[PDB]
Amino acid sequence: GAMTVFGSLGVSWDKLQWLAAALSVGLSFGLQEIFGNFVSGLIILFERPVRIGDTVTIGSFSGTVSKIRIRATTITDFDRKEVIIPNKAFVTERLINWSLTDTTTRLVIRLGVAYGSDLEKVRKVLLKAATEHPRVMHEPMPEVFFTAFGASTLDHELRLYVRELRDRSRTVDELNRTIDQLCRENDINIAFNQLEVHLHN
Amino acid sequence: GAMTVFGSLGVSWDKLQWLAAALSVGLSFGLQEIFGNFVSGLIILFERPVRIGDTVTIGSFSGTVSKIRIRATTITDFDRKEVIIPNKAFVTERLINWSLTDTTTRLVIRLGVAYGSDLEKVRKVLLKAATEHPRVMHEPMPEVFFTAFGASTLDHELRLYVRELRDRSRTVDELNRTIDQLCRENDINIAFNQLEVHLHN
């Protein structure tokens, strides 16, 4: 209606078309964030860097991608808190996916040992607990590492492997239970924080 | 279809081509993030700043680069959490690579000693433990440094060298085990946190 009113009285389309074009660019630089999203979605769909069913972490948002679209991707979190992520972050921003070519993952079990202990006994107990599990992988050998002279307790890390991304927590539960039972049986001290006080009067 | 309908009724291509060009730039500034990625990938491929098989750290993401492409680079993390990084961060953003010209690295072993100890004895024990290893390099001499008058314990650092980037942790394990054994043998006190309390009533 405004265009018709202006044309029927002023008729200056050939006069304000340049202003229209300048305003058009100055105000259509608002669609960059949308067209980039669309192009990123198309690129993701064509290249297939992530597939449906794997675990993806981006921006401290780890979860299983459920549906992929041309505008936004839906990731079901571990609490079914559906996260909607623009595909521009999927294309032009770095991400992590845990199931790409080998669907295997290593996990660490950290513990502290008292200063007056037996490092060889602790290593044997940890290795036996890791090996006795009927699920941990054997081709990559699980190892125990002495990695830190802690302020109160020496730090020990057991880096061991799981080939299934689903049960990454039940294995940790069983391993920790077995480690605690073996430590209690073999009398390995897991000391608390320690300090020395000098007192007078 | 819309173009044909507009042309067959209005025929104003020569009238809205300027608006088309303005919108084209305003909405094709959405491909900057993609073309920069492509050009960065091409530049990385030509210049070869990083090769396949070395260890690269960028944005707190350290791992071994597996495949390099024109759009995104794949880095297998230490947990096989495949990180997909746009090559724009590889070209226009700083990074670190541990295997460029000499594939060697120095590592530090930190420990604390009690105030009432023998600094010369501690230095001798640390140097003997560092030297007795059959892997640490000898051309750069390993040294022990007294670097901090700590609040509770004096801080000692052993900076020693490894020429292989693969076994950077097993050497640390063996060195720490040997250091602990030698300290226990020679009676060197690794004190905990200490404080003094004044009490009354």
Numbering used by the authors:
A (entry chain A), B (entry chain B): 897 to 1097
What does the paper say about this structure?
Amongst these family members, MscK is unique in that channel activation, in addition to elevated lateral membrane tension, requires the presence of certain external ions such as K+, Rb+, or Cs+ 32–34. The E. coli MscK (EcMscK) channel, consisting of 1120 amino acids, contains a large N-terminal periplasmic domain (PD, ~500 amino acids), a transmembrane domain (TMD) with eleven predicted TM helices, and a cytoplasmic domain (CTD) analogous to that of EcMscS. The MscK channel forms a symmetric heptamer, with each subunit comprised of three distinct layers: an N-terminal periplasmic PD, a TMD with eleven TM helices, and a C-terminal cytoplasmic CTD. To better understand the biophysical underpinnings of mechanotransduction and to establish the molecular basis of dual activation in a ligand- and force-gated channel, we have determined cryo-EM structures of EcMscK in distinct functional states by leveraging GOF mutants.
To potentially improve structural homogeneity and to achieve a functionally distinct conformation, we decided to characterize a GOF mutant G924S, which, in contrast to the WT channel, was active under elevated membrane tension in both KCl and NaCl conditions. Thus, the cryo-EM datasets of G924S in NaCl and in KCl were essentially indistinguishable, which allowed us to combine the datasets to further improve the reconstructions of both the closed and open conformations to overall resolutions of 3.84 and 3.47 Å, respectively. The final atomic models fit well into their respective densities and were refined to good stereochemistry. The lower resolution reconstruction of the WT channel is nearly identical to the closed conformation of G924S, and hereinafter the higher-resolution structures of G924S are primarily used for structural analysis and interpretation. The innermost pore-lining helix TM11 contains an apparent kink such that TM11a defines the transmembrane ion-conduction path and TM11b runs nearly parallel to the membrane plane and extends to the cytoplasmic CTD. Akin to EcMscS and AtMSL1, the pore-lining helix (TM11) in the resting state is kinked, and several bulky hydrophobic side chains point to the central pore axis to create narrow constrictions. A hydrophobic gate near the cytoplasm is constituted by V921 and F925, which are conserved amongst MscK homologs. In contrast to EcMscS and AtMSL1, an additional constriction at the periplasmic side of MscK, with a pore diameter of ~8 Å, is formed by a ring of seven tryptophan (W914) residues. It appears that MscK possesses two physically separated hydrophobic gates along the pore: an upper periplasmic gate and a lower cytoplasmic gate. The arrangement of the eleven TM helices generates a midplane bending angle of ~30°. The periplasmic gating ring is primarily held together by packing interactions of inter-subunit three-helix bundles, in which one of the interfacial helices engages its entirety at the interface in the closed conformation.
